[PDB]
Ligand SMILES: O=C(O)c1ccccc1O
């Protein structure tokens with residue numbers, strides 16, 4: 003149901019649970035691409051790609067802005083996420099070669 | 100392209116940007132449902148529903164477990180997301196109710 007067709011918290015919570023599961027499934031598939039990424043790193047030191055992160059974060063802020071969400075909170079959340087995936091990628095690189 | 104069909108970082112980053120966009124879009128729609136939730140609350144006090152949050156978090160850990168992601172990271176990320184939405188819902192309630 004749309005937010006305005008929701009008759010109570012049962013409806014609201016079904017939709018929220020679905021959206022959050024979608025997010026979890028996307029973060030899981032995100033990990034697949036991050037591991038695949040390590041095939042195109044020339045060295046371990048290539049992994050963090052700070053210029054790439056610098057480009058990503060304002061992009062995510064813009065998306066926040068365009069979707070009616072506080073840009074600082076979303077951008078900072080994605081800073082945490084991206085740096086966490088980087089850390090995982092390093093660990094994965096080390097463990098698989 | 101699938102992670103395994105990606106032929107370089109150009110392909111990897113296209114898919115990651117698509118995934119991160121879907122996540123921002125989903126957080127955007129989630130906000131609509133959180134604000135709609137408020138017309139089913141009594142005062143600033145019924146808003147945080149601690150019994151609801153407590154059931155939510157290990158459900159999110161489980162989904163992370165089933166999607167091959169570190170469960171504390173995902174559980175911790177959602178504690179952060181959920182508590183920020185509660186905050187926004189209180190602000191929203193003050194502003195409109
Ligand atoms: O996960 C990412 O988005 C990322 C970005 C830059 C470098 C390494 C990474 O894992």
Ligand SMILES: O=C(O)c1ccccc1O
Nearest residue numbers: 146147148151184185188
């Ligand atoms: O955003 C939520 O998931 C939430 C959960 C419990 C209480 C208030 C809320 O906004």
